[PDB]
mmCIF file of C-alpha atoms and ligand atoms in Angstrom:
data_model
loop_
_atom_site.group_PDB
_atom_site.id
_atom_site.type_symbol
_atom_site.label_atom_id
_atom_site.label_comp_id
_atom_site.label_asym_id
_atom_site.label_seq_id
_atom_site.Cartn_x
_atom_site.Cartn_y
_atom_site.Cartn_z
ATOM 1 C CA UNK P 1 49.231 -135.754 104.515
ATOM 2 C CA UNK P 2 46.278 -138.127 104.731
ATOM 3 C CA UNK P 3 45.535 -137.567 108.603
ATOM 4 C CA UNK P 4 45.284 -133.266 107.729
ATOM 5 C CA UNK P 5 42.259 -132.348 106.404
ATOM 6 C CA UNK P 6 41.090 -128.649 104.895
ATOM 7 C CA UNK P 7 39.125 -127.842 107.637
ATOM 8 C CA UNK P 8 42.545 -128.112 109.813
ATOM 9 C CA UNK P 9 44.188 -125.440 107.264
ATOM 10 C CA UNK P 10 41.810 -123.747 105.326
ATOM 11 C CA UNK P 11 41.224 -119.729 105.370
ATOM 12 C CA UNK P 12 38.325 -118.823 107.426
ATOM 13 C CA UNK P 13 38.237 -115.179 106.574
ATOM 14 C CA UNK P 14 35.486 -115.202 103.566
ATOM 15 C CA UNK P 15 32.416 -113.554 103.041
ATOM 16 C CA UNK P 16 29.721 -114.641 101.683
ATOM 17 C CA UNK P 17 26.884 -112.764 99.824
ATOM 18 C CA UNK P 18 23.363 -114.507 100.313
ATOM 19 C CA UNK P 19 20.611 -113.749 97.747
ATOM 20 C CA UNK P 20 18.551 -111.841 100.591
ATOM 21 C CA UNK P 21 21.655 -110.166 101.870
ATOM 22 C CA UNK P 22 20.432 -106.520 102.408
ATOM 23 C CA UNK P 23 21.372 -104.045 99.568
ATOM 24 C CA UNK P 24 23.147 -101.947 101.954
ATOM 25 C CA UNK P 25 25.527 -104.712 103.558
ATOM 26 C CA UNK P 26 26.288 -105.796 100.027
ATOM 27 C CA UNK P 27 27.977 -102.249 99.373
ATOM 28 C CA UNK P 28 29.512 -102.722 103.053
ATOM 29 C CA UNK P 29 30.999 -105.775 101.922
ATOM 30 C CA UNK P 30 32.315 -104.982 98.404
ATOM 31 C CA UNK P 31 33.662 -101.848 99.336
ATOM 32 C CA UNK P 32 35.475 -103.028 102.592
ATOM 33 C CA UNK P 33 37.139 -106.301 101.007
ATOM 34 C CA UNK P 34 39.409 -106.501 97.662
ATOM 35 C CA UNK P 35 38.609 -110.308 97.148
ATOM 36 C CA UNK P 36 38.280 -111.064 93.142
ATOM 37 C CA UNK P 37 35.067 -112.926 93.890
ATOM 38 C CA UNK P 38 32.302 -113.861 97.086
ATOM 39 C CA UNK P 39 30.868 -117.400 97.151
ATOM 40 C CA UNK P 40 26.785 -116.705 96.846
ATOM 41 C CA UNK P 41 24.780 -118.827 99.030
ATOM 42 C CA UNK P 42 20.919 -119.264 98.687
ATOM 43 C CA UNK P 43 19.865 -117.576 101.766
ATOM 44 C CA UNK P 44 21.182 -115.968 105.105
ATOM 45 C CA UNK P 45 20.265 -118.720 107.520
ATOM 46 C CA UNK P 46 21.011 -121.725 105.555
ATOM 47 C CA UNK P 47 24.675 -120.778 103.902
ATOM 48 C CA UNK P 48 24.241 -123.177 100.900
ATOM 49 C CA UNK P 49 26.593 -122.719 98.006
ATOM 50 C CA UNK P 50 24.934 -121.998 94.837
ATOM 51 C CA UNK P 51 27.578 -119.762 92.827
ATOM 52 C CA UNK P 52 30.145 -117.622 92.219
ATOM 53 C CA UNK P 53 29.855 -113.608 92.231
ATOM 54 C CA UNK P 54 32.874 -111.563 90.462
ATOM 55 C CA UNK P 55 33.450 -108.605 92.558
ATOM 56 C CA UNK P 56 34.058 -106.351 89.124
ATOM 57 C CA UNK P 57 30.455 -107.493 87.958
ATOM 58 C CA UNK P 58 28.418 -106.703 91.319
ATOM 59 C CA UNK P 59 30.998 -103.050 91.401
ATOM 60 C CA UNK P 60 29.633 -102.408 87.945
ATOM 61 C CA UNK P 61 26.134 -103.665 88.559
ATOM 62 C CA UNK P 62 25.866 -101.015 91.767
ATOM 63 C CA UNK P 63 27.196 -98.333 89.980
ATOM 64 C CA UNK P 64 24.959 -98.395 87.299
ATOM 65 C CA UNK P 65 21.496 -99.050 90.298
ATOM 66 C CA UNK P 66 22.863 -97.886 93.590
ATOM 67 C CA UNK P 67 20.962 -98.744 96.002
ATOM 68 C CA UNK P 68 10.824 -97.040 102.381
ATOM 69 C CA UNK P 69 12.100 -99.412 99.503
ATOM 70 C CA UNK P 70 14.753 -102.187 100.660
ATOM 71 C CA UNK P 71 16.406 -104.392 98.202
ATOM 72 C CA UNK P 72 18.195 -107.287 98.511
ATOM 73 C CA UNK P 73 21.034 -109.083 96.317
ATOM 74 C CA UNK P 74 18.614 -111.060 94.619
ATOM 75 C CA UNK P 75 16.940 -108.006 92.975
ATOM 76 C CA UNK P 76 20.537 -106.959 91.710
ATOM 77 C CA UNK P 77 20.770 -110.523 90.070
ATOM 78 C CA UNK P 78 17.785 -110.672 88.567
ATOM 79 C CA UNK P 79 18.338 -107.180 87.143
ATOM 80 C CA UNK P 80 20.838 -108.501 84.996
ATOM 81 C CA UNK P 81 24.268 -108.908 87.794
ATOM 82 C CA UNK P 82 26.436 -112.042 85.794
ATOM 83 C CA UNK P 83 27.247 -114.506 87.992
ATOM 84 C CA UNK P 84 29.244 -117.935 88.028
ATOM 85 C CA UNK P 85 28.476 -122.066 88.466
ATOM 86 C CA UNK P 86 30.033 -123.420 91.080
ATOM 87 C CA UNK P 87 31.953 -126.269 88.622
ATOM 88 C CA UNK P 88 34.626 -127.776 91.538
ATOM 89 C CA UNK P 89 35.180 -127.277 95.236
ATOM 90 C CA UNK P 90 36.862 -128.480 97.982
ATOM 91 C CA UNK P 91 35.092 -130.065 101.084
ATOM 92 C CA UNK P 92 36.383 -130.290 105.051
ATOM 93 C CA UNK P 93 37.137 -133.688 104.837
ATOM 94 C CA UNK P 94 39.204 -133.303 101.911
ATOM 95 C CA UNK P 95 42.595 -134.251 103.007
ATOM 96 C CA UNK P 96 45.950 -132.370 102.657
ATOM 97 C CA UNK P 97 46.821 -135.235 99.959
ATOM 98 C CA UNK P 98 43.898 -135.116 98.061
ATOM 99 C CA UNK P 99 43.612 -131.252 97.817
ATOM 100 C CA UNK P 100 47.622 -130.687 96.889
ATOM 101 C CA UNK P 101 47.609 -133.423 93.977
ATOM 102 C CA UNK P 102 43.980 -131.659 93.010
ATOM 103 C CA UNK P 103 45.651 -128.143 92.713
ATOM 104 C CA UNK P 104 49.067 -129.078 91.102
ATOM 105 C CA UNK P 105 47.302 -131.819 88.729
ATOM 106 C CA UNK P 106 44.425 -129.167 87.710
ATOM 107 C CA UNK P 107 46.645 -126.507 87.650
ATOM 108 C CA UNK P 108 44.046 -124.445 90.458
ATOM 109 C CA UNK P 109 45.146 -121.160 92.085
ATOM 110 C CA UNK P 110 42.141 -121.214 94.665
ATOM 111 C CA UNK P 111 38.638 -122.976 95.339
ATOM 112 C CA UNK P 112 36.563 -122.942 97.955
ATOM 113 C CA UNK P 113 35.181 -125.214 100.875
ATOM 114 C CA UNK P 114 31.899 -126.265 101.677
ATOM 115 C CA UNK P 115 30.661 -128.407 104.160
ATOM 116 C CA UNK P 116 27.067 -130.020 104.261
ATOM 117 C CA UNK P 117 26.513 -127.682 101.034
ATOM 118 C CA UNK P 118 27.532 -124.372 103.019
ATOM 119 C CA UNK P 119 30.450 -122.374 102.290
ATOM 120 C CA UNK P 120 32.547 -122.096 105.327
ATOM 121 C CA UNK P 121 36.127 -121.427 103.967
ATOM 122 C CA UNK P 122 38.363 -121.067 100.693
ATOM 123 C CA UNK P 123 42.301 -122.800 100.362
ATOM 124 C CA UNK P 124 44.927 -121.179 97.977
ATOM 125 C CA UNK P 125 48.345 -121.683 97.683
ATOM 126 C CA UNK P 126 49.315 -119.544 100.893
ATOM 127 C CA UNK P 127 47.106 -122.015 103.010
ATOM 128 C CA UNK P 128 48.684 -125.177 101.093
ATOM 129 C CA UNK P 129 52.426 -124.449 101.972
ATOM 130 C CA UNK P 130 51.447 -123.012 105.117
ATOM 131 C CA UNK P 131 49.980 -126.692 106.097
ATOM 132 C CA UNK P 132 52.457 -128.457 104.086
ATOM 133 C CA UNK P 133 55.472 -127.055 106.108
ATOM 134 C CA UNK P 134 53.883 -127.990 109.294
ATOM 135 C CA UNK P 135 54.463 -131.637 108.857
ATOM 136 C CA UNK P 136 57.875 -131.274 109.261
ATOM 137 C CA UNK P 137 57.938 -128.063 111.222
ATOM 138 C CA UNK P 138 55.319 -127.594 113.472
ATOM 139 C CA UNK P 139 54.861 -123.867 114.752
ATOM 140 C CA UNK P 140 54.950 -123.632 118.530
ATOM 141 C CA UNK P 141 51.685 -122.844 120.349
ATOM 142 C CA UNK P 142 50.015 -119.487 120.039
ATOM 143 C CA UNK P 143 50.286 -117.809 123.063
ATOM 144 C CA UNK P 144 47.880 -114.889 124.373
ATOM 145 C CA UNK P 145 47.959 -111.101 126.062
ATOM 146 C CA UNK P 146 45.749 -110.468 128.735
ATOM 147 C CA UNK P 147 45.025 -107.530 131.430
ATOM 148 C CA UNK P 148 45.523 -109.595 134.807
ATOM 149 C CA UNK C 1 33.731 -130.778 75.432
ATOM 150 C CA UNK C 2 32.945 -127.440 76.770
ATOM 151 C CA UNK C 3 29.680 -126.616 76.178
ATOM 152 C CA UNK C 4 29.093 -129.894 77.374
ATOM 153 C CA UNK C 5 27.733 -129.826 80.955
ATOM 154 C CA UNK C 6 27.798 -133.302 83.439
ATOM 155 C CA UNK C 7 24.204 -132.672 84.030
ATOM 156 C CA UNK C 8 23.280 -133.646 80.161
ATOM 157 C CA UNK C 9 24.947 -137.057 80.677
ATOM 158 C CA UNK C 10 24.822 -137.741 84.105
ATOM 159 C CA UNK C 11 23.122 -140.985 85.530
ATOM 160 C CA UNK C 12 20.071 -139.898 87.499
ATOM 161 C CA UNK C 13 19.342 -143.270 88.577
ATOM 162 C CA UNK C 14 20.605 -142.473 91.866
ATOM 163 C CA UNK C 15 18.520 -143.681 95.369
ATOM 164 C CA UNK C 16 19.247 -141.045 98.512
ATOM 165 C CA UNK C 17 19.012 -142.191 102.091
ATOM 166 C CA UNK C 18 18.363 -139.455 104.245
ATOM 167 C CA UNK C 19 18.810 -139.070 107.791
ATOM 168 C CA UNK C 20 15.005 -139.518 108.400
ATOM 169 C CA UNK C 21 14.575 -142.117 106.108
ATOM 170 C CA UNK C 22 12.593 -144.543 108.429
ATOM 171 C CA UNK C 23 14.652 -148.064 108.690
ATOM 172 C CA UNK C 24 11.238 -149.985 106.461
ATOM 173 C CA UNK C 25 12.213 -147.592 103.924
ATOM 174 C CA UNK C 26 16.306 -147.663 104.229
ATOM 175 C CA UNK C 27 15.281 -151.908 103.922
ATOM 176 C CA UNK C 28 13.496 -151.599 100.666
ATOM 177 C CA UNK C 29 15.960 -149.398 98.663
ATOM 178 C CA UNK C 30 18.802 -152.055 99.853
ATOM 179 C CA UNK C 31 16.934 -155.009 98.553
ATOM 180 C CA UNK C 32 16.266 -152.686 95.206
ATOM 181 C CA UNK C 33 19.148 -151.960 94.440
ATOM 182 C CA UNK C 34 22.909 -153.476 93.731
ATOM 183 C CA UNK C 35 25.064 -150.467 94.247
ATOM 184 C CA UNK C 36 28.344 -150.261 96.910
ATOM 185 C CA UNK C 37 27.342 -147.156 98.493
ATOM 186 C CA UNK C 38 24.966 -144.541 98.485
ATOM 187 C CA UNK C 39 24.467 -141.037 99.250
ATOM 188 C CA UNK C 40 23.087 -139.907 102.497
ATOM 189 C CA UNK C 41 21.694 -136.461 102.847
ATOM 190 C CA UNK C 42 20.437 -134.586 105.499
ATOM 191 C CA UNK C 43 16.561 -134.881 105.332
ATOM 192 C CA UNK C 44 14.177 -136.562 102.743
ATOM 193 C CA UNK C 45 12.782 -132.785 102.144
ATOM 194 C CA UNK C 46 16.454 -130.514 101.787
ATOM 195 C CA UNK C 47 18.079 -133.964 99.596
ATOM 196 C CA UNK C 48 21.706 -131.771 100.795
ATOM 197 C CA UNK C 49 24.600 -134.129 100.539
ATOM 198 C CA UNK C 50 26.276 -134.768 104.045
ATOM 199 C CA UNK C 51 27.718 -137.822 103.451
ATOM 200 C CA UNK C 52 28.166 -141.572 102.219
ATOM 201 C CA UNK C 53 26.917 -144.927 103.311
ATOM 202 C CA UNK C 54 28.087 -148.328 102.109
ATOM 203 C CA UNK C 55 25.600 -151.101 101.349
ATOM 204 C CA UNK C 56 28.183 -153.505 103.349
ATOM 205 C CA UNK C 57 28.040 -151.716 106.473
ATOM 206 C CA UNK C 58 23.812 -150.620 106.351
ATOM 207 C CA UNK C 59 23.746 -154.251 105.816
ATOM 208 C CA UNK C 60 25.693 -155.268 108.912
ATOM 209 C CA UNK C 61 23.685 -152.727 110.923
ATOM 210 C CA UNK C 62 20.007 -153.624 110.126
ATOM 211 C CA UNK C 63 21.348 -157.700 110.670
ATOM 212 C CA UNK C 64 21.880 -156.201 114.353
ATOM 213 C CA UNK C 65 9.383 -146.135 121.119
ATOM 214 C CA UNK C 66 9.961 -143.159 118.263
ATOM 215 C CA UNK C 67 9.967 -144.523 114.668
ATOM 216 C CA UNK C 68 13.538 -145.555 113.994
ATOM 217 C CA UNK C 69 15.305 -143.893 111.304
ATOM 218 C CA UNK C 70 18.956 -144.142 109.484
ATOM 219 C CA UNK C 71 20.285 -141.729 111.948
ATOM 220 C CA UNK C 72 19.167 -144.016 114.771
ATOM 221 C CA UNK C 73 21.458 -146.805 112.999
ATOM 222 C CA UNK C 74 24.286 -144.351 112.461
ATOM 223 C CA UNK C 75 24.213 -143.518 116.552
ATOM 224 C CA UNK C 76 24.493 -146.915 116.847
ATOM 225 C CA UNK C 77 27.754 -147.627 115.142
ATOM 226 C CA UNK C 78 26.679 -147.628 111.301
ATOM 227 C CA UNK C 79 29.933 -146.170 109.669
ATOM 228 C CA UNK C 80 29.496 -143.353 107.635
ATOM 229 C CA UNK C 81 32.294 -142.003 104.942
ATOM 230 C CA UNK C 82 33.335 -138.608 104.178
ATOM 231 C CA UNK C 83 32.472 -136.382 101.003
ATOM 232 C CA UNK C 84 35.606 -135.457 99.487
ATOM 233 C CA UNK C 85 35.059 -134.650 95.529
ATOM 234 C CA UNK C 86 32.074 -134.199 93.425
ATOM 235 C CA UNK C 87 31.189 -132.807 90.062
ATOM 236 C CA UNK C 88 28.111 -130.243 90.016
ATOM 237 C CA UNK C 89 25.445 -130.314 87.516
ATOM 238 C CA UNK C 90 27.413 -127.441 85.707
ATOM 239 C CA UNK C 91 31.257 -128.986 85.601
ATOM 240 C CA UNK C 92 32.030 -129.457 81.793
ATOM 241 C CA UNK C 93 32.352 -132.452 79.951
ATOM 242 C CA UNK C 94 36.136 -131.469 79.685
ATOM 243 C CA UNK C 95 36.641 -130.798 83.644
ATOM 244 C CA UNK C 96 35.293 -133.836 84.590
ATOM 245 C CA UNK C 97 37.394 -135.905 81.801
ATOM 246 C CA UNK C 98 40.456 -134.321 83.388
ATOM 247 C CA UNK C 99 39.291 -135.259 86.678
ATOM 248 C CA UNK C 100 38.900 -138.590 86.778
ATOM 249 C CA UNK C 101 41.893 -139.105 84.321
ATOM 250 C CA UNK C 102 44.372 -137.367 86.331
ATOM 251 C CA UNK C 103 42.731 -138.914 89.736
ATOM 252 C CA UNK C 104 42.518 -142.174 88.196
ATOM 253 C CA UNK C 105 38.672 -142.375 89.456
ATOM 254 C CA UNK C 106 35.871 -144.517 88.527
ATOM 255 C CA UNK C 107 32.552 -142.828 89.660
ATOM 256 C CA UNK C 108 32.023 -139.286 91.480
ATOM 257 C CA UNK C 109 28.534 -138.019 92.812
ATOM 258 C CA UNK C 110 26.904 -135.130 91.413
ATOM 259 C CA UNK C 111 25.537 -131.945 92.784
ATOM 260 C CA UNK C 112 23.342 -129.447 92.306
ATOM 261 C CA UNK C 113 22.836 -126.169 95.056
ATOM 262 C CA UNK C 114 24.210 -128.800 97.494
ATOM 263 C CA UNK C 115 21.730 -131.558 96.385
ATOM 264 C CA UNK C 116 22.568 -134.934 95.408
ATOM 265 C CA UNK C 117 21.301 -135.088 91.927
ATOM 266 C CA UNK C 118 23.308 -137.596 89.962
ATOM 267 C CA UNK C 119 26.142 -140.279 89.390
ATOM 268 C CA UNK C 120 28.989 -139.709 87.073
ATOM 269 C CA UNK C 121 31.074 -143.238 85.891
ATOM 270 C CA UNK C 122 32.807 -144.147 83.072
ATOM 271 C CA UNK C 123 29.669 -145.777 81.335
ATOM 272 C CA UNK C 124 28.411 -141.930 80.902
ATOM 273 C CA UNK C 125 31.302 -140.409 80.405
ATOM 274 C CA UNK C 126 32.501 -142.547 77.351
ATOM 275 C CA UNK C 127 28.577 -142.336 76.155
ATOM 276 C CA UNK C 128 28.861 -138.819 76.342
ATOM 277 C CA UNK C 129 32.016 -138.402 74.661
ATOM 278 C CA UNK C 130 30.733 -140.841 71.941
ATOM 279 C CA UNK C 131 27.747 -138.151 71.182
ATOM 280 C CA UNK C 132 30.262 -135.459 70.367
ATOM 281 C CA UNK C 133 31.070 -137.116 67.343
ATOM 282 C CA UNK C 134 28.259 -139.849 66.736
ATOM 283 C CA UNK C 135 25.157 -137.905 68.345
ATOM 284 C CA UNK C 136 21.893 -140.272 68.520
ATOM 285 C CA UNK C 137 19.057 -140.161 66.235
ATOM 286 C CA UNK C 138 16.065 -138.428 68.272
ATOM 287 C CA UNK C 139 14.249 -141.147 69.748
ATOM 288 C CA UNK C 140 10.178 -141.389 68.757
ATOM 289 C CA UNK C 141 7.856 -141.489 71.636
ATOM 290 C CA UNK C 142 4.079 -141.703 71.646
ATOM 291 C CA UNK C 143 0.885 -139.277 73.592
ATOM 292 C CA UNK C 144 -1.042 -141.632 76.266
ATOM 293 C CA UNK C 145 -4.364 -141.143 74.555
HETATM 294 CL CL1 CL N 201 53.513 -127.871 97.641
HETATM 295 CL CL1 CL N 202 47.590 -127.386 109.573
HETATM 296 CL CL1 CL N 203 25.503 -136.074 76.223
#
């Protein structure tokens, strides 16, 4: 458990919302995923952590100012959109060890995964066992489908 | 403890090496300072933690053109250690009790947005624990007329 890291087991699938995400790809987003929260990162290009959006709070916040005259997540925030510190993370060098006694010791249901500040991946329970059982039982190698 | 936030106690007596910190530079904050490690970010400008350096191993390296810089060192065989755990300026004074009780640790780097921005050891933590109960007197300081 000390040779697996999170980056060997952690969930790729996340989406991020960057303060100058577009207006329009932020209603894309929330109304095409049912995740309870998106990491925010400072800007598009760089992908730096910097909190925690609730999806119920941005839902409520574009109901009440749904989105010529672009906007931008930022402008949502600042109108008054709650948001959340990033207080604890995990990071994809954090190994299999480290991260299992950090959930079961902190009693944690989820966090996510940064490296070099940038979000780039979340680990829950379902990841945990997942990587867990393949120390003992390794799955056999994916194999692909292909029009020859 | 939970209004409390590691920022208000942390130790921000904390020397970066960046990846373009010229080697001059990387020799003066060694012979400055007395820690075991420090934190190396990418550049002197974005101060975004990437990594960790021990003093041991910078020390080793700089006893062994284009201005040469700590990332000319690392290329050449300077170890560098992985970030595994932080606090951020915004953990609580309760999460990071819990922390390093249950992990049985002794000092965590802070961040901030990615930055490196602080130290967290025992020495603050019990000070800061101290001032829940005991809070210091505000201190008196005078104008530079
Ligand atoms: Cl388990
Ligand atoms: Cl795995
Ligand atoms: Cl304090």
């Amino acid at each position: 458990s000390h040779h697996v890291r999170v980056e060997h087991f952690m969930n790729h699938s996340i989406t991020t919302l960057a303060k100058d995400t577009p207006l329009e790809e932020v209603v894309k987003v929330v109304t095409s995923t049912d995740v309870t929260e998106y990491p925010l990162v400072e800007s598009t290009e760089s992908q730096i952590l910097v909190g925690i959006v609730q999806r119920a709070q941005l839902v409520q916040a574009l109901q009440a100012e749904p989105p010529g005259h672009q906007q931008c997540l930022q402008d949502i925030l600042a109108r008054g959109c709650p948001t959340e510190p990033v207080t604890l993370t995990l990071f994809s060098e954090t190994t299999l060890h480290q991260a299992q006694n950090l959930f079961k010791l902190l009693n944690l249901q989820s966090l996510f995964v940064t490296s070099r500040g940038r979000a780039v991946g979340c680990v829950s329970w379902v990841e945990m066992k997942k990587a867990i059982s393949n120390l003992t039982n390794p799955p056999a190698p994916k194999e692909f489908l292909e029009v020859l």
